[PDB]
Amino acid sequence: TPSELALYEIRKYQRSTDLLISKIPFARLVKEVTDEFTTKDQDLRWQSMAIMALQEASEAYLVGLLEHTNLLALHAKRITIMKKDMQLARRIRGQFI
DNA sequence: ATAAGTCACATGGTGCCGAGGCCGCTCAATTGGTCGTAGACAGCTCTAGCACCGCTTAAACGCACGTACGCGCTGTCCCCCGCGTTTTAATATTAGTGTATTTGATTTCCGAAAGTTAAAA
């Protein structure tokens, strides 16, 4: 059952209490973002714990925006989200757009 | 027979070994006490409120009604994905070095405090 399996999947990671992005990717991503933001001479270290908190804030915001963008698609009487759709959802939420 | 003497006996006491029983030192923050000052107050006066009428006619609400407008309608285009598959790169392990932090001893730093006075509607 495609719908049954995928909806069950929503519910199980919906009630899962934990972060879910790939980790070594996320860590190297923040590392290179700091490296490019930082310059020639001053370089910055990262422990486990900062990377932690960064991750949780990113997860929480993107999931919140995710229900909102899903909802703007729902308001379009559809179930795909698009560029314009979410672009807007976020931008209506205001920050960073 | 008995003062000397040997002797064993009996009790003394001196020495060392735990050990359970008091003790000693320190720092928490309480509370005890005490200055000095925010706090509530002591006559108070007047502010902008908020009625309290007493008008007017500018909004406004309904009376009419009308295109605009919506809202499902409807062929159909399309696109998302449910997988199925190969990839594919995400694991998550050791690692020592290379500062990163880091915590002592100062060691200057500097502005709150105490005069002294500049300035100030």
Q: Which residues contact A56 (CB under 8 A, 6 or more apart)?
A: A19
Q: Rounded CA gap, A56 and A45, in Å? A: 19
CA of A12 to C1' of B22 (A): 66
In the three-class reduction of DSSP (H, G, I as helix; E, B as strand; rest coil), residue A53 is classed as helix
Q: Rounded CA gap, A70 and A32, in Å? A: 30
Please work out, in degrees rounded to the nearest 5, the angle formed at the alpha carbon of residue A11 by the alpha carbons of A8 and A65: 130
Resolution in A: 3.4
Q: How far is CA A78 from the centre of its chain?
A: 22
Q: Rounded CA gap, A27 and A46, in Å? A: 9
Q: Rounded CA gap, A47 and A85, in Å? A: 37
| Domain A1-97 classification at class level | mainly alpha
> Residue ranges per domain, chain A?
1-97
Q: Is the CB of A80 under 7 A from strand B?
A: yes
Q: Which of A9, A63, A55, A40 is nearest to A71 (CA)?
A: A63
In the three-class reduction of DSSP (H, G, I as helix; E, B as strand; rest coil), residue A41 is classed as coil
Residues 18-77 of A with CB under 7 A from strand B: 22-25, 43, 45
Q: Rounded CA gap, A87 and A15, in Å? A: 27
